[PDB]
């Protein structure tokens, strides 16, 4: 990918759904995304439009005022709060004579610049190749000044000229072959991703997947609960790959905490099909931890966006994760006084600051009931000579305290079914 000069940006949108408050929230979200990507928001405006214009996405008068304001502000970058077409952007650029992009372009740029591993780097690269695929003919610069780019001649018999297919068709063929190879690669690495956790889910153990829109967890909850410090940030879309740890109850059974990358509303429908890591992880997860901010202007918007994405993937993959418990964190920030408004209709709203915080005792005590569904529930009496009667009765996972007796000891705890099925004797 290619990164150019930033920090001089304008924002254009059309408010065709929701209310003025929602349009403003979308504008603010775009502003925050641009800020994180490394831009300085100068002016962002929304037009009350039923549907975007098929020429400039804004309209003639809107484009005029945008030209005026951008010329006065000395910026050269425009950002549309949506998914514009090559036709839209061609006019939107011819009207201003400065670079133009949209929110999906911004998100692909930030993903590309935040990518950590070759895996995600290739995923994001494929996303941007497939977004730029339509602009072969749509690339007016590629298909302009091209008089005589090929052999515009014919004849009966010997021609000797070998553009047997239109130059544009050859370009389409080559880019299609490149994209096919990349798709084959991203499908191939499915097996690599699988074998990486192959050991996991073989020895069945509860898996709690931490889900949340972007800027919700940013691995902060992971670092706070498990105790393992990983890349945690207040910026957006910082955790680019998942990570599991050992955190659990006092019980020896591990509760593998599955990290999840953020999910921004209104995805560009290019990563939801490429970045399969988190999707597969939530598919195979046993419990779900839904992260929410208690000081946001509309937490319910993100809540339902996440719920919708989850339901879509669930119906797509033929699964059903019943356990779905939410948690309204970011209350220690004290930046939201709608705490009563949230609590009057949303239980399990424990409080943790944006980056730090505590008070997850109630969280854990309420979450355990949904994962501590073991079937052991077997007691036994070990005889005088314990000897080797310590292997899986004490040196195991979910092992509990018990009483003591002269004839060895009455172990009133629970022994795992697969580990110790019948080895014990009452």
């Amino acid at each position: 990918y290619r990164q150019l000069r930033l920090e001089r940006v304008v924002l254009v949108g059309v408010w065709t759904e929701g209310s003025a408050a929602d349009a403003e929230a979308s504008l603010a979200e775009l502003a925050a995304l641009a800020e994180t990507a490394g831009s300085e928001v100068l002016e962002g405006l929304i037009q009350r439009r039923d549907k975007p214009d098929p020429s400039t996405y804004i309209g003639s008068g809107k484009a005029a005022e945008l030209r005026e304001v951008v010329l006065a502000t000395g910026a050269d970058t425009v950002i549309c709060d949506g998914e514009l077409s090559p036709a839209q952007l061609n006019a939107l650029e011819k009207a201003v004579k400065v670079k133009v992009i949209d929110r999906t372009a911004l998100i692909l740029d930030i993903f590309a610049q935040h990518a950590t591993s070759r895996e995600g780097k290739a995923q994001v690269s494929l996303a941007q190749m497939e977004y730029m695929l339509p602009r072969l003919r749509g690339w007016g610069e590629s298909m302009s000044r091209q008089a005589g780019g090929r052999a515009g001649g014919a004849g009966g018999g010997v021609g000797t000229r070998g553009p047997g297919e239109t130059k544009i068709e050859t370009d389409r063929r080559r880019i299609r072959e490149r994209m096919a190879k990349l798709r084959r690669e991203i499908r191939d690495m499915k097996k690599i991703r699988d074998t990486q956790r192959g050991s996991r889910r073989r020895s069945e153990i509860p898996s709690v997947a931490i889900v949340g829109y972007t800027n919700a967890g940013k691995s902060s909850l992971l670092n706070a609960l498990t105790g393992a410090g990983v890349l945690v940030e207040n910026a957006l879309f910082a955790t680019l790959e998942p990570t599991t740890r050992r955190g659990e109850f006092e019980d020896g059974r591990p509760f593998v905490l599955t990290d999840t990358v953020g999910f921004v509303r209104h995805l560009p429908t290019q990563l939801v099909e490429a970045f399969r890591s988190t999707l597969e992880e939530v598919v195979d997860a046993d419990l779900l931890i839904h992260v929410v901010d208690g000081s946001d202007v509309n937490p319910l918007a993100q809540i339902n966006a996440v719920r919708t994405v989850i339901n879509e993937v669930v119906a797509e993959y033929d699964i059903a994760p019943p356990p779905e418990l939410l948690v309204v964190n970011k209350i220690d920030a004290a930046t939201g006084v709608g705490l009563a408004q949230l609590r009057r209709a949303l239980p399990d709203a424990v409080f943790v600051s944006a980056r730090t915080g505590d008070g997850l005792d109630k969280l854990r005590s309420r979450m355990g009931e949904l994962v501590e569904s073991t079937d052991a529930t077997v007691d036994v009496t070990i005889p005088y000579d314990r000897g080797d009667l310590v292997a899986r009765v004490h040196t195991d996972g979910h092992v509990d305290a018990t009483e003591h007796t002269d004839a060895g000891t009455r172990i009133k705890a629970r022994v795992p079914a697969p580990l110790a099925a019948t080895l014990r004797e009452y």
Binding site: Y384, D385, R386, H404, D406, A407, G408
Partner: protein, 133 residues
Amino acid sequence: LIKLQIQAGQANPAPPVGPALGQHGVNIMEFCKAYNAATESQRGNVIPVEITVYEDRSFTFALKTPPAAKLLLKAAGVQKGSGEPHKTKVAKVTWDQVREIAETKKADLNANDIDAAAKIIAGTARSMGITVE
């Protein structure tokens, strides 16, 4: 042969004692009775014990002693302590058993030499930071 140093004022509450007495084909109550009659009668301080079960199922122990590092444990000390070396002072040991500390055991793992007292004066003291004043 097993040896222990954790709190010894016990009446078979924990696995180290109860199962130990009930295992290894020893009498279920004879050694416990002797243990309680002798060591607990003698204030039941820290009393390491070595298991050398003969064919008669009886191994007479002695009035053992922790090293010069933690003699206060038996003398007048609390069970508390530290794990890191060179840790802050926890307690002191008065110059009352300066020689009696050397009357318990005199040997090492290897057959190198003797004077385990002259060894322990500084061997196992600096491990946790326990002081001797």
